[PDB]
Every structure is written in C-alpha cells, then in structure tokens.
Amino acid sequence: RKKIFKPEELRQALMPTLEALYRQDPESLPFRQPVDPQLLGIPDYFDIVKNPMDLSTIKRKLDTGQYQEPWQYVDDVWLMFNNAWLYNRKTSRVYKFCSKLAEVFEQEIDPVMQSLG
Numbered sequence: 001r002k003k004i005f006k007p008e009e010l011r012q013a014l015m016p017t018l019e020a021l022y023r024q025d026p027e028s029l030p031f032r033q034p035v036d037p038q039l040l041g042i043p044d045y046f047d048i049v050k051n052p053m054d055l056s057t058i059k060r061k062l063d064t065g066q067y068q069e070p071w072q073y074v075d076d077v078w079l080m081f082n083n084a085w086l087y088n089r090k091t092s093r094v095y096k097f098c099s100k101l102a103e104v105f106e107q108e109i110d111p112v113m114q115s116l117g
C-alpha cells in the first residue's frame with residue numbers, strides 16, 4: 001500500500017546525494033547557508049523567492065526527520081535550484097553554479113530513488 005520510510009533510512013540513503021552537492025567547490029558556496037537579503041544588497045529577494053531553501057536547511061531536515069518520503073527531499077533540492085534560476089541573472093556565478101549542481105544532483109539521485117521505491 002503506502003510505503004513507510006523511517007527517518008534513519010532516508011538519511012542513510014539520501015545524505016550521499018546531498019554530500020555530492022556540498023563537495024562541489026566553488027559551485028556549492030552560494031548554497032551552503034540561507035540567502036541573507038539584508039547582509040547582501042537585496043531586499044527584493046524575498047519578494048521574488050517565496051520559499052527559500054538551501055543545503056543547510058535540507059541537511060537539517062534530513063537530520064531531524066522532517067521528510068516522510070524521498071520525493072519531499074528531491075522537491076526541496078529542486079526548490080533551491082529553481083529559486084536560484086528565478087532570482088539570478090544568467091551570467092551570474094550563482095546561476096551558472098546552480099546549473100552545475102543540477103547536473104551533479106541528477107546523476108546522484110536517480111539510482112537512489114530506484115533503490116528507495
């Protein structure tokens with residue numbers, strides 16, 4: 001019927017896919033902590049980005065058992081990517097780095113999602 005996932009199983013299976021993103025340098029650097037619009041010059045950020053997401057938040061959600069099923073994790077990774085592509089200019093470091101992370105993530109996540117069902 002509905003498949004139940006234990007938080008420790010999700011963490012064991014999915015954390016390596018997150019670690020693959022963290023390992024990218026310089027590409028993960030903009031994504032390791034939440035965007036701070038006041039520190040940066042950018043008070044329009046949260047006008048445009050309604051649901052912020054970043055690697056530290058996704059990690060915390062895996063660590064604290066906030067995901068019930070693996071597609072919720074995938075959706076947060078993609079939310080992070082889509083926010084960055086929505087806000088940032090195509091020539092920017094953040095935009096290009098986002099694209100690299102999306103390439104890495106795609107390769108990592110597919111066999112893991114097959115394994116989890």
Ligand SMILES: CCC(=O)N1CCOc2c(cc(-c3cc(OC)cc(OC)c3)cc2C(=O)N[C@H]2CCCN(C)C2)C1
Pocket residue numbers: 026029030031035036040041042045083084087088092093094
């Ligand atoms: C997902 C992140 C995100 O979408 N934002 C929103 C855009 O703002 C940036 C963010 C991160 C980085 C950034 C780039 C890095 O490259 C190596 C490393 C990094 O390591 C923490 C952060 C750069 C910018 C940026 O556009 N800076 C401009 C703004 C206007 C003013 N001039 C001077 C700076 C945060």
